[PDB]
Design a binder for this molecule. Structure first.
Ligand SMILES: CCNC(=O)Nc1cc(-n2cccn2)c(C(=O)Nc2cccnc2)cn1
Length: 187
């Protein structure tokens, strides 16, 4: 499953050699937050370009479900992150590392994956008065070539579009490599 994506990544994410697929990785994650907005449960989305070759997408929605199937011991979160709009599990497969943090029902939940493989079970890491989902990922440098860093203008163009196609949703874009920030929202 995850191995299929890792073997023929271009097929799932787009061209791995010119930045297209690299940025589609971000947009797949953003589309999940947009869907939570369209369901009427997320008002703000924050996309952050970190200085360590990762991007985070944060929303203030209900949170990815965190319950466990008692016979299987696997959380819903993990199912969502690992099982095959190409889906966040593709992004996971093609990240050297992905971190998931969910704020839901008063608790913070966290799980780490490498190349889509969960490193330990979803675990409680604190309490919180907020809700939402944060996905931070570091793209696989075995998959992506030539353009391996995120480029502000590509994200800015598409995030602006996503904000005007989903009117009422606030999308912030923050770049920690230079302090650049934008706020996209349409009425
Ligand atoms: C940064 C990326 N953001 C992101 O993935 N956001 C996201 C995703 C959700 N889900 C998507 C599939 C399953 N849940 C849900 C979701 O549907 N949560 C949910 C809905 C109903 C009951 N319990 C939990 C909420 N937010």
């Amino acid at each position: 499953g995850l191995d299929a994506v890792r073997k023929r990544p271009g097929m799932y994410i787009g061209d791995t050699d010119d930045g297209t697929g690299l940025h589609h990785m971000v947009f797949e994650v953003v589309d999940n937050a947009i869907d939570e907005a369209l369901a009427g449960h997320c008002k703000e989305i924050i996309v952050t370009i970190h200085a360590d070759n990762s991007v985070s997408v944060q929303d203030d929605g209900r949170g990815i479900p965190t319950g466990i199937h008692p016979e299987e011991g696997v959380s819903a979160a993990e199912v969502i992150m690992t099982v095959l709009g190409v889906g966040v599990s593709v992004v996971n497969a093609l990240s050297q590392k992905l971190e998931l943090v969910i704020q839901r029902e008063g608790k913070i939940h966290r799980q780490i994956y490498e190349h889509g493989v969960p490193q330990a079970p979803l675990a409680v890491t604190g309490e919180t008065e907020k809700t939402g989902t944060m996905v931070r990922f570091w793209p696989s440098l075995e998959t992506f070539t030539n353009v391996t860093e995120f480029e502000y203008e590509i994200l800015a163009k598409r995030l602006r579009e996503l904000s005007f196609l989903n009117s009422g949703v606030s999308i912030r874009l923050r770049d920690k490599r230079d302090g650049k920030e934008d706020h996209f929202h349409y009425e």
